[PDB]
Design a protein around this nucleic acid. Structure first.
Ligand code: MG
Ligand code: MG
Ligand code: MG
Ligand code: MG
Ligand code: MG
Ligand code: MG
Ligand code: MG
Ligand code: MG
Ligand code: MG
Ligand code: MG
Ligand code: MG
Ligand code: MG
Ligand code: MG
Ligand code: MG
Ligand code: MG
Ligand code: MG
Ligand code: MG
Ligand code: MG
Ligand code: MG
Ligand code: MG
Ligand code: MG
Ligand code: MG
Ligand code: MG
Ligand code: MG
Ligand code: MG
Ligand code: MG
Ligand code: MG
Ligand code: MG
Ligand code: MG
Lengths: 201, 150, 261
RNA sequence: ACUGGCUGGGCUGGGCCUUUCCUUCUGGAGAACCGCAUGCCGGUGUGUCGGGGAACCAGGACUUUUACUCUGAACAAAUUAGAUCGCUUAAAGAAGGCCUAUGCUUGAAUACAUUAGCAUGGAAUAAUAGAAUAGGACG
RNA sequence: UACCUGGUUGAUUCUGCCAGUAGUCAUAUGCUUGUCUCAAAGAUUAAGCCAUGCAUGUCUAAGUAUAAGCAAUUAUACAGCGAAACUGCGAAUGGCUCAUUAAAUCAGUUAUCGUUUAUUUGAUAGUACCUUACUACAUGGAUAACCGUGGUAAUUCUAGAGCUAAUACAUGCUGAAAAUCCCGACUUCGGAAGGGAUGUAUUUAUUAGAUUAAAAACCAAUGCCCUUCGGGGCUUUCUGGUGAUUCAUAAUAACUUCUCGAAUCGCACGGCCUUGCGCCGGCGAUGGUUCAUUCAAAUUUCUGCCCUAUCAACUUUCGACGGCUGGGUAUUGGCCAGCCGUGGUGACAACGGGUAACGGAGGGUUAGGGCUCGACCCCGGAGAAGGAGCCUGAGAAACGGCUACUACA
RNA sequence: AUAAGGGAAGUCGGCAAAAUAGAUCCGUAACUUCGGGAAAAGGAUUGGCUCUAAGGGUUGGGCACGUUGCGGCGUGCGGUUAACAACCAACUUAGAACUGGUACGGACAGGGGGAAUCUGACUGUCUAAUUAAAACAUAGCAUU
């Protein structure tokens, strides 16, 4: 099958090597698995030394981490929008490591509401469609929450518009072909601005 | 070296596991711990160049601000080509002894090494190289110090 | 070659095993264990070729079957068990104890030891650090691992082991003025006192020793075996490992021969 | 068995001064020299002396670089040279030997290989660098 | 043992070759042949083709026994030997040969802070809640051997019918406290009831992993003791290792067709009291997470191989030199997929052609320097008529393992 | 105009007909007057639909004052935007996915080739109405 030896290559002087030996059990290769977003599907493979690996064919969720706060919540993936390697990979909605994706902001918004008592990214006030208020059963919370707000700080202007739409850009930091997991963190700041500048021009 | 800009490529280059966008600001002397540029010292009485400390270049093959360690044999040679990108070719000369004729003859070999953007190397310069892990098909050495020219 | 080997061909065995080149084609091939393959003392070779208790191979495996002889206080049931430096083998029925130790000519020899003091050992540490859960531990030259050590103990030192409870009773630092024995290389059996150590950055340092007869010699750190500072704790064999040259060796054999008869 | 001697011949040095002699820091350690108390008959073993500070050890800072040579470390069993033991000698072999023993004891050595790589001393012979538009050395 | 003699001419001295002479662990062949110690032998030409027989199986007091098996008759659950068969392990070790192969193999010297590792040896795991509960004094269905009935000229080919076991397969709870972070019912403004989580494996993000001279001065927040009642102070926990790491290890927020944390087996017979089939209690086989060790394996740094120029330029179609982003592999790497530069070796002999070429330790021949041989008892590499592909297994691109083509049969 | 199987066995003689044919990418011998032979010989691709990438033009760049009614100027004096912003405009080249009764220069248009001998060097010209050739002419050479 596929071989990963360097014997069949040609030396740096241009000389052509001669036949030495047949292909060996080690130095082998395996068929690549092209991960796509869809309902979950994972296959098992028995690798060297009796261990096992996981070929991921279709995934729909994975862990993504918010940097400054430090929270990781499981959510669903909307689509992939950029990949530094090949453009044809991007649109076909195939997922690998270091792929820029777009994610749903509902779990992060709800956690933000629970941890901090302030609303984040709400321009629906013009519609007043989903206005609702629930009486909060305490008074000790305000000193703690206002202390957190006055100490930690405020979010940068770029990120609230993304939360207003409910979709955020992120970069995959996991190995889908190796571990069968799509993991990453939401990207922000000047590193975000580089991608936004490149994405639409 | 002379580099016009640091980000002139399709992807974004950054040092791994170096957090760069932190809400709280803390000033620390440590290179990588506080959140600013990271660097260390290889050892063997080799001093980190000054240009590295304040430089902005990103390199995964430089012995400084990189993920490569210098270990193994240390060699010397004569530089013959420095006109390609981030790679140099060195020539080393020696004398072989023929026992039957009771006298020597000269021989030479060619070597390929990776040059960091911290140094600026031109033709006819003295260099010292150290062994490292395979960086390419035929690149296994890294430059550490350039001696002043005659 | 499609896996690891399981046979060892005779005429390739280590020289210090002292195997005749005739009378067979194969060698015992000691099994895997705590000691290196190159420098080990198989139990079958020791019992049959040195003590002359067993005539040939067939009854050699029968002898161990009664569990009469033990090493390091624990019974071993494989005939080709790799014994090594400093190891103590105890036979209760006959009433003597043996320790495998180099002679002055670089081979294993029989050495009687007393029963009461033959119940402890000592070995050099290879690396010291904390393991899982933050518990510090060390490993010696005979694959003995001990957790929670003395914080002053560092690498390359030697530690005294009780051999019954595995507690760190005592230890010896590695510094100048200590008494050491070489364990690898050509300088087999010499005993000397550390004079001074100079190190070379990049590995493979050398150390200089000096014999009792004002001789001077050097060896690698991986080959030095410290057994005390003064008045060595273990009992050295006859000759004290001084390596007189052939001139005095020839003088002494006729001198004692003529003195006796 | 064998001792002294001979300004005996050297031979290998190890200190000096000649305009030259030998870089350097910290820490450990620690004697010598003089003296003391007590022992004694002017110094010592006391030392749990102080005016001490040979030599050593463990660590920092610098030193033109090669070729060359000396001494070390590391490196295979077998083979070659080569020491010992009367398989009746020998080619071989690593055995055996000792009064009488219901026992004791030893050997199974050593040098070379020689190319490349790692340390140390020597500094002739053969190459290389340095202050001239001073862009030179020092406080 | 550092040695020579015969041959051109009418006779002489030389260059020069022809001949003689000796060794061979160097082969063939001829004549002849009594004894003693040791014993190489279808390598050379055909890595050409093979009838016949053999060369790999394995059981302990200790995995699974209802043999219409034997033997006894203390074991009414058994207890010896136990055919057969299930299950576990080995069969990738040994043995043969030298076809290909000219920086390829190999040798000496380095390395893995760039990986996998059966077995042996030594240490090592409070299931917090799930599932008030499922049973824990212990879970649930098949199958072998076997009785009996068949097919084909033919094989270590097999059908359907009826039973029953696991250390085969599949599930599943029981010996503690401290501690940690969120949410907080509560309001007095300080606080406070209560809820939940937290072994190990996997993957990602973040934090700590200190140094090696000292002296003040404020400002904001703003601790005690002493106390004169204004105040005087201020003193201060650990923190490993390498020449060198993002190292060893700890902590936080979560996740998972997802592991492990023991429903196994046998030979020896004791202690308590509330006296009930009550409780406690010693040595060994078959396992199991992580670390250490051993046998190793794959890659990897430097230098060293026969003759030939009537072989002087070679390499990048369809990777040739290097950069970047990924895929794949046990891991690094142009090993592979995309984008961007135009490189790399050579008269100091590259590239190619010959080799009646496996490499080395080494054999033959000697003043010294050398010449020649090395398939072959020791080490390393490759192959089983010629090519490729693959299962099981830690380990195979295996041929006394399978699949397909070609040539024989 | 078309024909099963054979493919020049027909005939003085492959006469007539058939076969190849555009463009892009590979590959190309003997011989030679070194210019050629060469489109040598011999191979692969070609539709529809939805996308990606490359090849351009025009207008703008700081202060410090003085006329003319926020503007054209007159000037003096610094920096080269680590090349930015807006608008305008036709075609040519390369690459990818999907799709079909495997078809796609779909009509038209459109070279058969190779190994040798005789003869004239080549381009050119003539018997209008039976012969276009080896005949004539040609540059070169030699003579009067
Ligand atoms: Mg090291
Ligand atoms: Mg043959
Ligand atoms: Mg054959
Ligand atoms: Mg039984
Ligand atoms: Mg051959
Ligand atoms: Mg174990
Ligand atoms: Mg099981
Ligand atoms: Mg060149
Ligand atoms: Mg061959
Ligand atoms: Mg050989
Ligand atoms: Mg072999
Ligand atoms: Mg094979
Ligand atoms: Mg095969
Ligand atoms: Mg066979
Ligand atoms: Mg086989
Ligand atoms: Mg027809
Ligand atoms: Mg037809
Ligand atoms: Mg035809
Ligand atoms: Mg005809
Ligand atoms: Mg006819
Ligand atoms: Mg025609
Ligand atoms: Mg053509
Ligand atoms: Mg032609
Ligand atoms: Mg197409
Ligand atoms: Mg066509
Ligand atoms: Mg003719
Ligand atoms: Mg014509
Ligand atoms: Mg006419
Ligand atoms: Mg006509």
């Amino acid at each position: 099958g596929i071989s990963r030896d360097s014997r069949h290559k040609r030396s740096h002087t241009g000389a052509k090597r001669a036949f030495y030996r047949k292909k060996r059990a080690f130095e082998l290769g395996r068929q690549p698995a092209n991960t796509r977003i869809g309902p979950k599907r994972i296959h098992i493979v028995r690798t060297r030394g009796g261990n096992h690996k996981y070929r991921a064919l279709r995934l729909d969720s994975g862990n993504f981490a918010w940097g400054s706060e430090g929270c990781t919540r499981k959510t669903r993936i909307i689509g992939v929008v950029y990949h530094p390697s090949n453009n044809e990979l991007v649109r076909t909605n195939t997922l690998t490591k270091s792929a820029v994706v777009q994610i749903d902001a509902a779990p992060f918004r709800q956690w933000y509401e629970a941890h901090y008592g302030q609303p984040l990214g709400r321009r629906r006030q013009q519609k007043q469609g989903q206005v609702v208020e629930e009486v909060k059963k305490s008074k000790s919370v305000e000193k703690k929450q206002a202390a957190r707000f006055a100490a930690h700080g405020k979010v940068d202007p770029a990120l609230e518009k993304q939360f207003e739409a409910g979709r955020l850009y992120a970069i995959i930091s996991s190995r889908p072909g190796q571990s069968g997991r799509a993991d990453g963190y939401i990207l922000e700041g000047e590193e975000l601005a580089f991608y936004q500048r490149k994405l639409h021009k | 070296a002379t580099e016009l800009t640091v980000q002139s490529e399709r992807a974004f280059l950054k040092q791994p596991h170096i957090f760069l966008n932190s809400k709280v600001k803390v000033k620390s002397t440590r290179p990588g711990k506080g959140g600013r540029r990271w660097y260390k010292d290889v050892g063997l009485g080799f001093k980190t160049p000054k240009t590295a400390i304040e430089g902005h270049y990103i390199d995964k093959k430089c012995p400084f601000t990189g993920m490569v360690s210098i270990r193994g044999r240390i060699l010397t040679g004569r530089v013959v080509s420095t006109k390609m990108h981030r790679t140099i070719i060195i020539r080393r000369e020696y004398l072989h002894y023929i026992p039957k004729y009771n006298r020597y003859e000269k021989r030479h070999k060619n070597l390929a090494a990776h040059v960091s953007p911290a140094f600026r190397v031109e033709e006819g310069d003295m260099v010292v190289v150290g062994q490292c892990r395979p960086l390419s098909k035929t690149v296994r050495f890294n430059v550490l110090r350039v001696l002043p020219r005659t | 070659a499609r896996g690891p080997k399981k046979h060892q061909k005779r005429l390739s065995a280590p020289s210090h095993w002292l195997l005749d080149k005739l009378s067979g084609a194969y060698a015992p091939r000691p099994s895997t264990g705590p000691h290196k393959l190159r420098d080990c003392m198989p139990l079958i070779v020791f019992v049959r070729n040195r003590l002359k208790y067993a005539l040939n191979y067939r009854e050699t495996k029968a002898i161990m079957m009664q569990r009469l002889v033990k090493v390091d206080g624990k019974v071993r049931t494989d005939i080709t068990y790799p014994a090594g430096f400093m190891d103590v083998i105890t036979i209760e029925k006959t009433g003597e104890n043996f320790r495998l130790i180099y002679d002055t000519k670089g081979r294993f020899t029989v050495h009687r030891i007393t029963d009461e003091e033959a119940k402890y050992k000592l070995g050099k540490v290879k690396r010291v650090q904390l393991g899982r859960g933050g518990v510090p531990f060390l490993v010696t030259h005979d694959a003995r691992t001990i957790r929670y050590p003395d914080p002053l103990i560092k690498v390359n030192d030697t530690v005294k082991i009780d051999l019954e409870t595995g507690k760190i009773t005592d230890f010896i630092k590695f510094d100048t003025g200590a008494l050491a024995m070489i364990t690898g290389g050509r300088n087999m059996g010499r005993v000397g006192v550390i004079t001074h150590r100079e190190r070379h950055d990049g590995g493979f340092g050398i150390v200089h020793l000096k014999d009792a007869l004002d001789n001077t010699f050097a060896t690698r750190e991986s080959n030095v075996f410290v057994i005390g500072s003064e008045k060595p704790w273990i009992s050295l064999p006859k000759g004290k490992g001084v390596k007189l040259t052939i001139a005095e060796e020839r003088d002494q054999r006729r001198a004692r021969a003529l003195a006796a008869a």
